[PDB]
Amino acid sequence: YMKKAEARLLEEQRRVQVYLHESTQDELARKCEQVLIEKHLEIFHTEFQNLLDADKNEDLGRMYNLVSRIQDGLGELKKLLETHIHNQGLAAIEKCGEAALNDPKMYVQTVLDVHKKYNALVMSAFNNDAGFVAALDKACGRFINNNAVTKMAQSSSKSPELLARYCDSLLKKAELEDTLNQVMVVFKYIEDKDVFQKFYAKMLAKRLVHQNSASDDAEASMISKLKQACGFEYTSKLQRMFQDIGVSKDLNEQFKKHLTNSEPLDLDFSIQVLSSGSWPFQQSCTFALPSELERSYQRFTAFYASRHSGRKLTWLYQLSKGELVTNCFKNRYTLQASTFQMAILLQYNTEDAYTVQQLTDSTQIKMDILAQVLQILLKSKLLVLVELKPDTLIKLYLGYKNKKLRVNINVPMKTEQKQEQETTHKNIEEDRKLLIQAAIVRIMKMRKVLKHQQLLGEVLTQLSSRFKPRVPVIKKCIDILIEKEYLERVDGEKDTYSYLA
């Protein structure tokens, strides 16, 4: 019927142009449109839904061409398209199930597939109309910010975290540009951008410290994209890490030059010296330095004290690694391990057995970390005696074999990731509270006397680009700032605050 109606309209145009007066053209066109299209809009809506369910782009384009002639006839189509896109996104996300909560690639790929399909549909069939683009954007934001994955985590901050994890996986060790651009398109619809920024910064610090990146050009491209999307302050904060990396490599080179005019050390030494305020790493736990590494530590401490006067060094032993070569086994192996693994491994060479209650005192390691590293070693087929007790006897297992000379026994702990994620989310919460307080102070400083609704509107307008504040949080921030004598309530004229210098 759509093709028949289009042909009939063309025929009527021919008739009126060929053998009728020109004053009849508009009336004939309006009457024909009213008879042929406007009277069957109820059937057209059902047909539109059916064609949306079963992908038929040409029919959708023909319908868009037909209904565009009617005044204010495209609103129902836009609403139906928005509802369909929202439902399709929710259904696609729900099908992934339990795995999507811990698999960033699946989540981002599902979202990208839905967005790509419906964006191509909007361009091809609806002629890139503004209303359909707006409907697609609204639906995309709706099912990106809230879905089945977010309900499982009981928070809407899971999506930015998964996006950041996907970016980290992509940038770890020609097609990368396209997926980075797609990620940047996804990032626009996210409302909690601060979570994404924090997680990306922490994972970039992890990549830079351990020197595990695919390529520097990819990092530069991602930084440029972040500049285009985010502001200038975030990129400025990120650039300090690269500056410190360059300073550290220069210092390491000049220390290697210095070591020539002295007694050579017993090991290959590389050092990463980082500013304390530009990196997210916290203070290391207690640790007894083993006797083999004393010389290098003393030499570098003396060198740093010689070059710099008011700088003291804090050593993060949980981020330090290295390679161990062993010979008192069945054969010759090289071992890649962290400092803690070396401490709980090199502690004995000719000895065969030890007690954990004594080993922790010897190595000065806390309980939980020592238990985790011991069970990591146990699962690595390098140590033998599931539960650990202070009186448990642990002995080295001879006869262990490997299929390759090079072995990486440095695997991440299970609880480490969950603890890190929880700590990051909490720190984001206190950061949000502090930003709200600072903004309230700023508006109260500029405007000496102000009401409540105006202050709330100003705070939301100023903080909108990063997160959407909640009214109870703003009220709590106002209350805590009142206690700190920053602003006070005027006597009388209730619900009004005034700045107090």
Partner: protein, 86 residues
Amino acid sequence: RFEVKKWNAVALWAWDIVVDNCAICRNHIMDLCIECQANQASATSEECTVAWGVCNHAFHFHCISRWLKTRQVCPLDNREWEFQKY
């Protein structure tokens, strides 16, 4: 017998002008503020953390916030203060 072929170490540097203590108030940097510890515990004492600047100086957040009400200069170096960590 185990031998260390190579070692990759990570270190953090900070100013030694103050020995693990705040400058405005002469107490441990990891402890509470003078006002916080003298007064009773409340919601204000919950947010008592350490703050870092661009110049890489560490003070209590309450101490530096109180200082910044009248002056806009870091107590140790005369450059302008800017928060960079919490």
